[PDB]
JSON list of C-alpha atoms and ligand atoms in Angstrom, two decimals:
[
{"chain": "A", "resi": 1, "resn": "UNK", "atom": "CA", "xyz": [0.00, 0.00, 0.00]},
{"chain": "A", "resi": 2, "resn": "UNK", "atom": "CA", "xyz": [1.10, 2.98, -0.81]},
{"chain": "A", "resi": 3, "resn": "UNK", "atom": "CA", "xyz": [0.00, 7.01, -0.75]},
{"chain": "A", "resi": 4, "resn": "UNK", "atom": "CA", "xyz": [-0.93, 7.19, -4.17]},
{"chain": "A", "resi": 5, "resn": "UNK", "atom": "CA", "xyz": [-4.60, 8.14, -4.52]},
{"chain": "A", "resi": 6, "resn": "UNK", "atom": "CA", "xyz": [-7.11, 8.62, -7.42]},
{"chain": "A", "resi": 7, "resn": "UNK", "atom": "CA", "xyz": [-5.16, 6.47, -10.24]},
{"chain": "A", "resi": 8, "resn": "UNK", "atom": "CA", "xyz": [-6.77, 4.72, -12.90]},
{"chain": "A", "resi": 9, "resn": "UNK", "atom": "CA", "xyz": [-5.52, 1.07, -13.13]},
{"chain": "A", "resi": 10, "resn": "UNK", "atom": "CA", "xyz": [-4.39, 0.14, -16.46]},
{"chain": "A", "resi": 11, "resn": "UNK", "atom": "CA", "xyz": [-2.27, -2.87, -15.71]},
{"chain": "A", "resi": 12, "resn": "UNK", "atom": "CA", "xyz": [-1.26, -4.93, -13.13]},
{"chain": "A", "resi": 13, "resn": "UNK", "atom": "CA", "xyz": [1.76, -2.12, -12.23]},
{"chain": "A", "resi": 14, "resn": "UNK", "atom": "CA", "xyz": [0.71, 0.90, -14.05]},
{"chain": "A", "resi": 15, "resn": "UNK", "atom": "CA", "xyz": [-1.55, 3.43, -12.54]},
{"chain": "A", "resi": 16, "resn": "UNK", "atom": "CA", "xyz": [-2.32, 6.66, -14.85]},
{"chain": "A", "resi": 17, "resn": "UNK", "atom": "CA", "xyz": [-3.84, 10.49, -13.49]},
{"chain": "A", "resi": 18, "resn": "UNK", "atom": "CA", "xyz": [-4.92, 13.68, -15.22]},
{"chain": "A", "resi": 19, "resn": "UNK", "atom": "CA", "xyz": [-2.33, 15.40, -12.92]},
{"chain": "A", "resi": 20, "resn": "UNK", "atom": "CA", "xyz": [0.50, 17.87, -12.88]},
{"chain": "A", "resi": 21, "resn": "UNK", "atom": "CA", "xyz": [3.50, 15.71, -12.31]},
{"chain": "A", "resi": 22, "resn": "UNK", "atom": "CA", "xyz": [5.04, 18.71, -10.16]},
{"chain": "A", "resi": 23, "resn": "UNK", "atom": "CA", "xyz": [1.65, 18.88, -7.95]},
{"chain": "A", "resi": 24, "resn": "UNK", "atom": "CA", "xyz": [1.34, 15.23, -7.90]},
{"chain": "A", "resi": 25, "resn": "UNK", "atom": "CA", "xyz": [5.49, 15.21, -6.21]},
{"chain": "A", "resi": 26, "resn": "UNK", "atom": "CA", "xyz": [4.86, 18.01, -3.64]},
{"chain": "A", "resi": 27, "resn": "UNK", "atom": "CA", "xyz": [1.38, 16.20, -2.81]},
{"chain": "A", "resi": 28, "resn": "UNK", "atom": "CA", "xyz": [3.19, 11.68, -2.12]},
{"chain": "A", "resi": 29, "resn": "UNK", "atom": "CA", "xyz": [6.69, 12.94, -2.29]},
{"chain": "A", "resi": 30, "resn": "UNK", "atom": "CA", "xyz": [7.24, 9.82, -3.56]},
{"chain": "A", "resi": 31, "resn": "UNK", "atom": "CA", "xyz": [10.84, 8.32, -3.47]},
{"chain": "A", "resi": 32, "resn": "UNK", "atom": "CA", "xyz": [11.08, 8.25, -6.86]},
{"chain": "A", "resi": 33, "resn": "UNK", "atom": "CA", "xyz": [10.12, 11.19, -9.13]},
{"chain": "A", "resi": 34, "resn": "UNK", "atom": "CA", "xyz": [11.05, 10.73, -12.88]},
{"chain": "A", "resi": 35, "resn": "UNK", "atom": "CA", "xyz": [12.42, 13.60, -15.00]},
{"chain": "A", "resi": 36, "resn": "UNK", "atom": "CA", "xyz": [12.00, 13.83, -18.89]},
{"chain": "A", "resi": 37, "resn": "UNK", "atom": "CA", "xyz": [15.43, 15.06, -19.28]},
{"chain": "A", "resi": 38, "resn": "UNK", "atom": "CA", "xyz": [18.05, 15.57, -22.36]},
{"chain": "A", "resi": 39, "resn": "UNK", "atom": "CA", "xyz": [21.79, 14.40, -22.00]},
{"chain": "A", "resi": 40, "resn": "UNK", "atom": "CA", "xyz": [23.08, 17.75, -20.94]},
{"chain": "A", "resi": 41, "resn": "UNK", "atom": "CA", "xyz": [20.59, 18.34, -18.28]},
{"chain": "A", "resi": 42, "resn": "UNK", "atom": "CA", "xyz": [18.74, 21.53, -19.37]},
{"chain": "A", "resi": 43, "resn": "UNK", "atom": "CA", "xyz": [16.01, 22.00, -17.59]},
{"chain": "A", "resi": 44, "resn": "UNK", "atom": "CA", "xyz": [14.45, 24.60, -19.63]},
{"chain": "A", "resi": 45, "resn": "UNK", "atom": "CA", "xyz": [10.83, 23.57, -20.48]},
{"chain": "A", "resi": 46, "resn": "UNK", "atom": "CA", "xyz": [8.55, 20.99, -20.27]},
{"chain": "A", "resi": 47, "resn": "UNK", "atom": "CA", "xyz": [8.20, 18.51, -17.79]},
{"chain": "A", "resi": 48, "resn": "UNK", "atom": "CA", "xyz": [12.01, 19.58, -16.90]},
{"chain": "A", "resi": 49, "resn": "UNK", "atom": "CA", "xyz": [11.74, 22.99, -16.66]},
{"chain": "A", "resi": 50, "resn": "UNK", "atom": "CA", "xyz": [8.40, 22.57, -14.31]},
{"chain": "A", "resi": 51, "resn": "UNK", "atom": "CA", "xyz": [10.25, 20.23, -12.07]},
{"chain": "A", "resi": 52, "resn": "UNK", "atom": "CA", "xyz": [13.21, 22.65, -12.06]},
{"chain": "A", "resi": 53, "resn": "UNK", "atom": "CA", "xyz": [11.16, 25.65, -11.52]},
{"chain": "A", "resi": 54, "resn": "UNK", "atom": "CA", "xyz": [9.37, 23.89, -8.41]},
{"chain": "A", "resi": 55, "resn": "UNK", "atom": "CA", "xyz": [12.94, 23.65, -6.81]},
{"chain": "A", "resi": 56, "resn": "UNK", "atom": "CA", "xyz": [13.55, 27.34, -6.76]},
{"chain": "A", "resi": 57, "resn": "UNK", "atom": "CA", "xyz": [16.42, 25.83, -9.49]},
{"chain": "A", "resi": 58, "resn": "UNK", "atom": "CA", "xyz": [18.19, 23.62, -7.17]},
{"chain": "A", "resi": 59, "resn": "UNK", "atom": "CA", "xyz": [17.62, 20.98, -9.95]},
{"chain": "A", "resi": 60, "resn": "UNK", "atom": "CA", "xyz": [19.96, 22.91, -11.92]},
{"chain": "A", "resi": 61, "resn": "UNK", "atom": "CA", "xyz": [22.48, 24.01, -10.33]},
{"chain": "A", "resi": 62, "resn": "UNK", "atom": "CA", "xyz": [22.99, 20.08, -8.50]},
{"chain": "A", "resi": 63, "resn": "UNK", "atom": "CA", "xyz": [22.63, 19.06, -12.56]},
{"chain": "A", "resi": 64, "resn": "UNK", "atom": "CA", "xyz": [25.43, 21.91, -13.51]},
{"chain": "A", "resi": 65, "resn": "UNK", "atom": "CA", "xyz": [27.70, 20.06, -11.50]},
{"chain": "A", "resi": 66, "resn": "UNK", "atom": "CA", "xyz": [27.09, 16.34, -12.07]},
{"chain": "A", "resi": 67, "resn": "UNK", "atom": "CA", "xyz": [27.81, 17.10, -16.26]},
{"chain": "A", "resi": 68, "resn": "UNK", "atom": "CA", "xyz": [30.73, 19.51, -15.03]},
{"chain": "A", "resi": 69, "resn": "UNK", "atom": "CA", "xyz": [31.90, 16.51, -13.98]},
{"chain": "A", "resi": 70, "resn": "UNK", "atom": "CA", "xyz": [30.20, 13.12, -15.90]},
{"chain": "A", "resi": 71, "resn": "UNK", "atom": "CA", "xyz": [29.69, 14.89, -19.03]},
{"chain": "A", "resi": 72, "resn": "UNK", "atom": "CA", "xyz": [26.39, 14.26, -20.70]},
{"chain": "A", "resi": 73, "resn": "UNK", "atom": "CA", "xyz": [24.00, 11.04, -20.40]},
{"chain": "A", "resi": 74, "resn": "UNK", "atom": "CA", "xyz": [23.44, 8.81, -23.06]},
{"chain": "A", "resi": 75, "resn": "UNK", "atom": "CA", "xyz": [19.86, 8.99, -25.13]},
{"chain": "A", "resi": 76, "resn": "UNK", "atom": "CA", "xyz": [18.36, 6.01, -23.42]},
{"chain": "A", "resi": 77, "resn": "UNK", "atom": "CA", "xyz": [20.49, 6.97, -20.73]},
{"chain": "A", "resi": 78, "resn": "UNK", "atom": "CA", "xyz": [19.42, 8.24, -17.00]},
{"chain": "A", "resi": 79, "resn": "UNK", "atom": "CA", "xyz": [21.27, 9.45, -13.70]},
{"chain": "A", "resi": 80, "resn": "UNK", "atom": "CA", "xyz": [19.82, 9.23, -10.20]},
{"chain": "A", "resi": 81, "resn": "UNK", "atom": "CA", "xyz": [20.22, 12.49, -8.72]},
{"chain": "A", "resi": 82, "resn": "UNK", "atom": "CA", "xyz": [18.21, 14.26, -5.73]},
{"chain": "A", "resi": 83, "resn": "UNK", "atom": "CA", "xyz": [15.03, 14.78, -5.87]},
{"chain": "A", "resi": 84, "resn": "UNK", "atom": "CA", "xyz": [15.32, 18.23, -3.51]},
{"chain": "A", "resi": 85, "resn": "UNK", "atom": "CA", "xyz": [11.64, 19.22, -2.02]},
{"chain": "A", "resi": 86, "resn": "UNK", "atom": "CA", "xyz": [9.77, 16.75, -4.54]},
{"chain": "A", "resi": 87, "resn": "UNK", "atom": "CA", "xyz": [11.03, 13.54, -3.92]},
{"chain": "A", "resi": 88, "resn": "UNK", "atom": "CA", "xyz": [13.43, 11.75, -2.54]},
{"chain": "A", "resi": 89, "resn": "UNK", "atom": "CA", "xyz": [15.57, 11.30, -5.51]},
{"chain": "A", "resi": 90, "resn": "UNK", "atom": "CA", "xyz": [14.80, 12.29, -9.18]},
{"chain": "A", "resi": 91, "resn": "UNK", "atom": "CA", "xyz": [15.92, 9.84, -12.19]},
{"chain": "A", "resi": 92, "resn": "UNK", "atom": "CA", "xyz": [16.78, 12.03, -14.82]},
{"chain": "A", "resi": 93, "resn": "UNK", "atom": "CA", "xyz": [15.83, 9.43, -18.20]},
{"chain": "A", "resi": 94, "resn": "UNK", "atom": "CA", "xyz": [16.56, 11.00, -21.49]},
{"chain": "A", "resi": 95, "resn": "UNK", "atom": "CA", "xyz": [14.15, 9.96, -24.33]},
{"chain": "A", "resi": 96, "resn": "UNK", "atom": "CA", "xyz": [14.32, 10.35, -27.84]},
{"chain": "A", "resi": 97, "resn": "UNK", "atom": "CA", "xyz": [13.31, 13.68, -28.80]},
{"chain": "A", "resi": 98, "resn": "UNK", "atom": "CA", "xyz": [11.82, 13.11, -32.58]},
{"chain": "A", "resi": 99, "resn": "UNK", "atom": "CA", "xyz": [12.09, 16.61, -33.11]},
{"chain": "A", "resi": 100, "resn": "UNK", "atom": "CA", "xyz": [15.79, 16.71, -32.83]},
{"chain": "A", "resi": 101, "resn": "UNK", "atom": "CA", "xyz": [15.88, 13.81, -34.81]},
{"chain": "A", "resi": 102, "resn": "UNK", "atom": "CA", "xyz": [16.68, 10.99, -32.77]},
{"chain": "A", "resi": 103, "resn": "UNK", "atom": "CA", "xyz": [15.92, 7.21, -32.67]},
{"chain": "A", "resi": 104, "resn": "UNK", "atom": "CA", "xyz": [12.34, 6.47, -31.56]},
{"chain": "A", "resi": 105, "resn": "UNK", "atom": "CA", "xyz": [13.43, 2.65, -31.04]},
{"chain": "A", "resi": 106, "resn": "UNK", "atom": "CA", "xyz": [15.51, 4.25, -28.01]},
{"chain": "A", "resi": 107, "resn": "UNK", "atom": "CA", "xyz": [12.41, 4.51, -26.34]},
{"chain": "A", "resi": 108, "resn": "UNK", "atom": "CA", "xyz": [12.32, 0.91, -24.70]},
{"chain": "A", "resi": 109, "resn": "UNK", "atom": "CA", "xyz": [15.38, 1.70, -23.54]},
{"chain": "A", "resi": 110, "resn": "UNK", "atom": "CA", "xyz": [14.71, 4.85, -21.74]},
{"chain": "A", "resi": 111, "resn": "UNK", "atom": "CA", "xyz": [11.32, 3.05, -20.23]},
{"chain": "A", "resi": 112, "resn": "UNK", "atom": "CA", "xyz": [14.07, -0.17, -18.85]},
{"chain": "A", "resi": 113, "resn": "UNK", "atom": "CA", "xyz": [15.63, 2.52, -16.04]},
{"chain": "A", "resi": 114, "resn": "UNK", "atom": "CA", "xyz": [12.54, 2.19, -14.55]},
{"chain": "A", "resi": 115, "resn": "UNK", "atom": "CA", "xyz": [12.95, -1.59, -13.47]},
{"chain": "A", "resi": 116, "resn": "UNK", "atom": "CA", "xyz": [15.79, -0.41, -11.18]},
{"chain": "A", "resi": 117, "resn": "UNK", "atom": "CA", "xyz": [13.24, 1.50, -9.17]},
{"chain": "A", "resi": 118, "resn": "UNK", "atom": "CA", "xyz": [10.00, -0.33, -6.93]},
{"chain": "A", "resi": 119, "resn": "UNK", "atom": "CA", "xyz": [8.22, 2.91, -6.84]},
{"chain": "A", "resi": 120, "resn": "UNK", "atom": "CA", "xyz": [7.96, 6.05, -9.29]},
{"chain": "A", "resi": 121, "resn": "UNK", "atom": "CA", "xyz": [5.69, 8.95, -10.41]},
{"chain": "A", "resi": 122, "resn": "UNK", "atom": "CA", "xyz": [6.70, 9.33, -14.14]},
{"chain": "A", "resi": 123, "resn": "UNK", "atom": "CA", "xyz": [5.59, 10.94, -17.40]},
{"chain": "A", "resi": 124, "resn": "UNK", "atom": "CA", "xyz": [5.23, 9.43, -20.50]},
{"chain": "A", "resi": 125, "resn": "UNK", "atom": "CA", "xyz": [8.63, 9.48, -22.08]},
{"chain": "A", "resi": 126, "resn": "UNK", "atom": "CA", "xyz": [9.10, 11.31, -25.23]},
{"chain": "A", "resi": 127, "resn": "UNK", "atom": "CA", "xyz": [5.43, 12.76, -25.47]},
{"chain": "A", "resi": 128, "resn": "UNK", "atom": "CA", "xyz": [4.81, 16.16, -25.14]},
{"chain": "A", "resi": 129, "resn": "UNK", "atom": "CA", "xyz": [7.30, 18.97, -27.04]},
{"chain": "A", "resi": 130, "resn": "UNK", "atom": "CA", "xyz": [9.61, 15.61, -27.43]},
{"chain": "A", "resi": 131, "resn": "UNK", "atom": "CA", "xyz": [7.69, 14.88, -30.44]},
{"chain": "A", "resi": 132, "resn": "UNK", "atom": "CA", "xyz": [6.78, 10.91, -30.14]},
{"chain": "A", "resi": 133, "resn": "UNK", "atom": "CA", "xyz": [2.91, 9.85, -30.29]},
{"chain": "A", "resi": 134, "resn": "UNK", "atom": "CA", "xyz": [2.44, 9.07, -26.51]},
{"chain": "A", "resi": 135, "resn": "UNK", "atom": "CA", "xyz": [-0.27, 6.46, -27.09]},
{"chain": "A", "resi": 136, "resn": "UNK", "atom": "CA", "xyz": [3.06, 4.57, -28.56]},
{"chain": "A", "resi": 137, "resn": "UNK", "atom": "CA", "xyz": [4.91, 5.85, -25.17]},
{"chain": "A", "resi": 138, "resn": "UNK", "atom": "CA", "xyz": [2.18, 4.18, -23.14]},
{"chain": "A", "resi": 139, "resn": "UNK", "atom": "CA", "xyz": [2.01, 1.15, -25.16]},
{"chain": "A", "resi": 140, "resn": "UNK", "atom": "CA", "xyz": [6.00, 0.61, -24.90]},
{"chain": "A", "resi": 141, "resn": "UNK", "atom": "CA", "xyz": [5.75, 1.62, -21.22]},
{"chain": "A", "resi": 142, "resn": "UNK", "atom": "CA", "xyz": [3.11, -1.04, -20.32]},
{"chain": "A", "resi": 143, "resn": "UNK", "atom": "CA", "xyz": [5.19, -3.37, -22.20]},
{"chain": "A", "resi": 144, "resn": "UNK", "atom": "CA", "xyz": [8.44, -2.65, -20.61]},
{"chain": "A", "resi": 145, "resn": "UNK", "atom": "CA", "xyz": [7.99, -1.14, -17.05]},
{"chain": "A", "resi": 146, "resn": "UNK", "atom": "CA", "xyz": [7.81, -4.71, -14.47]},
{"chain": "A", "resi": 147, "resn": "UNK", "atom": "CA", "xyz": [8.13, -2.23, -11.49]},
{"chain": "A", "resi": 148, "resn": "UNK", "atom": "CA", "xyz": [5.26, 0.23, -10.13]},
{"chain": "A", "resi": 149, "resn": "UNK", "atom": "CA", "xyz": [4.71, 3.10, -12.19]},
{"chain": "A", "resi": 150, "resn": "UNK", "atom": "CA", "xyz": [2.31, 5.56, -11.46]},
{"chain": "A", "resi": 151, "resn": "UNK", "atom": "CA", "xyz": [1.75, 8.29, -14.74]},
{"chain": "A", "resi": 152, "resn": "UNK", "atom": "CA", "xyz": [0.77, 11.62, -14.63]},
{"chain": "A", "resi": 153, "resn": "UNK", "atom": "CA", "xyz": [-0.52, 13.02, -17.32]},
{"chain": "A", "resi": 154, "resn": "UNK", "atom": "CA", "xyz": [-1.36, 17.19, -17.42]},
{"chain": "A", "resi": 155, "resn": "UNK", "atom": "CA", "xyz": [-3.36, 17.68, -20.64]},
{"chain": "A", "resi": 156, "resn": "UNK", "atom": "CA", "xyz": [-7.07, 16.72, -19.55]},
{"chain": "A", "resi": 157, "resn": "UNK", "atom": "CA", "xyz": [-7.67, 15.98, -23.34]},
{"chain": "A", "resi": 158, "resn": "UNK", "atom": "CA", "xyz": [-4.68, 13.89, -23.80]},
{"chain": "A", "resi": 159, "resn": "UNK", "atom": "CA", "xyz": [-5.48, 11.93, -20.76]},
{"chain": "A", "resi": 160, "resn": "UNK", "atom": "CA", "xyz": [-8.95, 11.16, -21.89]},
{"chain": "A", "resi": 161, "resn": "UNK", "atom": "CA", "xyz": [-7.40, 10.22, -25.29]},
{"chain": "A", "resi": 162, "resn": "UNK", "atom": "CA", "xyz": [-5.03, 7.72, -23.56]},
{"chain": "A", "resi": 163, "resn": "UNK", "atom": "CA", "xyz": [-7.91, 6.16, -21.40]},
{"chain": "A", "resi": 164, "resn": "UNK", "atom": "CA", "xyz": [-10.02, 5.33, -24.26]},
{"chain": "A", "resi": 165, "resn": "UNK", "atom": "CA", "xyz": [-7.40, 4.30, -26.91]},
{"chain": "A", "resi": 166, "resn": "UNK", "atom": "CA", "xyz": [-5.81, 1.81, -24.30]},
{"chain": "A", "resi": 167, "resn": "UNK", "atom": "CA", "xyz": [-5.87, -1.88, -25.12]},
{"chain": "B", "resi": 201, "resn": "LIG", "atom": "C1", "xyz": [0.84, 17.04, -27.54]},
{"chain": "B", "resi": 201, "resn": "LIG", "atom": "N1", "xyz": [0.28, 17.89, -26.51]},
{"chain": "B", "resi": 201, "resn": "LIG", "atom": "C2", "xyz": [0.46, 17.59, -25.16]},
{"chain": "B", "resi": 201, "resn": "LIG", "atom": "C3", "xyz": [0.09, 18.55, -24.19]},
{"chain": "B", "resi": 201, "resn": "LIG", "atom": "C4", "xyz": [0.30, 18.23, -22.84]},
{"chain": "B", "resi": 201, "resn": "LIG", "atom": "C5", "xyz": [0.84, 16.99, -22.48]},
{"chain": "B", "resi": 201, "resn": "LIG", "atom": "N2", "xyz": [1.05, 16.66, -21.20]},
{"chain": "B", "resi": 201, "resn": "LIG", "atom": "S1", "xyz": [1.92, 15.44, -20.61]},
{"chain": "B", "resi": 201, "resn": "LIG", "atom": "O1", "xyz": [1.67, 14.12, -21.20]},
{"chain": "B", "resi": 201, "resn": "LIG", "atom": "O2", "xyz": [1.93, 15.46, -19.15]},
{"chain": "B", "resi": 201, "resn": "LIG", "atom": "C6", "xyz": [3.60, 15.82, -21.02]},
{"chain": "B", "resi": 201, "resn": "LIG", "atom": "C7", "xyz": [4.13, 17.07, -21.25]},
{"chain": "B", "resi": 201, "resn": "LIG", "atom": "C8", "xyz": [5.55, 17.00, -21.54]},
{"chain": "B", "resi": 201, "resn": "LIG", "atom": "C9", "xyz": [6.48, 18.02, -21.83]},
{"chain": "B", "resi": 201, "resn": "LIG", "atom": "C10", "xyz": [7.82, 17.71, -22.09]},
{"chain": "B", "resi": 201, "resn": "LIG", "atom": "C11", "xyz": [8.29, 16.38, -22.05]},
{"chain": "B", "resi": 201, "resn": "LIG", "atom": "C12", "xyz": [7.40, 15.34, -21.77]},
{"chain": "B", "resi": 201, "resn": "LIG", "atom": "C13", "xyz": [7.93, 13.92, -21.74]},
{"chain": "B", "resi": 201, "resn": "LIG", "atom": "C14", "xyz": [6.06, 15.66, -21.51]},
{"chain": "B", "resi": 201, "resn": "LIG", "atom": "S2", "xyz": [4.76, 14.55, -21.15]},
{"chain": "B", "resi": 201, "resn": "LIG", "atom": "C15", "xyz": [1.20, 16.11, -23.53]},
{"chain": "B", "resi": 201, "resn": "LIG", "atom": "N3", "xyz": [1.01, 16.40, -24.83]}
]
């Protein structure tokens, strides 16, 4: 049992919300909040730059120094790093972004840093201004993910798109 609440059950593991990932974090402050990262850590926009923002830019600055000294992650690649007043640590995963051109079959990959965690609050890799179709990021997540995964999902439309489309 965990504090979770209001999640639609889509698999045996995978629980799905119309939520703000950032509200959803300072609500469980689960252990395990999941970034939608690129290898050099820019938290500009997005999923990032909301997570970042909540943090007064702690993320940053703690993400400044681990490429200062690791360089950048690998697409399909992910660090653990802290998760400052969200969580108790943040995995940074980097997805394909289509629209800079990289390999959608990198996907699966990102999703498989998940099965090193029991717990997380995630988003749908690659969806959003990362250019995939998410319906394929849920798909590849349901078919990848063996740990619990609990997805939040901001656009109210999307969400209801996701439900309905889900086999
Ligand atoms: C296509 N239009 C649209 C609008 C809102 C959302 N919301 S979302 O699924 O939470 C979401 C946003 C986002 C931003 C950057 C990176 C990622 C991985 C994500 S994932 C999704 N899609």
């Amino acid at each position: 049992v965990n504090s979770f609440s209001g999640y639609l059950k889509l698999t045996d593991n995978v629980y799905i919300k119309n939520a703000d990932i950032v509200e959803e974090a300072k609500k469980v402050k689960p252990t395990v909040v999941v970034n939608a990262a690129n290898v050099y850590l820019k938290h500009g926009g997005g999923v990032a730059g909301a997570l970042n923002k909540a943090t007064n830019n702690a993320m940053q600055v703690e993400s400044d120094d681990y490429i200062a000294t690791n360089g950048p992650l690998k697409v399909g690649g992910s660090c653990v790093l802290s998760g400052h007043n969200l969580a108790k640590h943040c995995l940074h995963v980097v997805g394909p972004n289509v629209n800079k051109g990289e390999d959608i079959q990198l996907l699966k990959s990102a999703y498989e840093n998940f099965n090193q965690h029991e717990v997380l609050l995630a988003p749908l890799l690659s969806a959003g201004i990362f250019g995939a179709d998410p319906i394929h990021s849920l798909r590849v997540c349901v078919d990848t993910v063996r740990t619990n995964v609990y997805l939040a999902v901001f656009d109210k439309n999307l969400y209801d798109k996701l439900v309905s489309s889900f086999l």
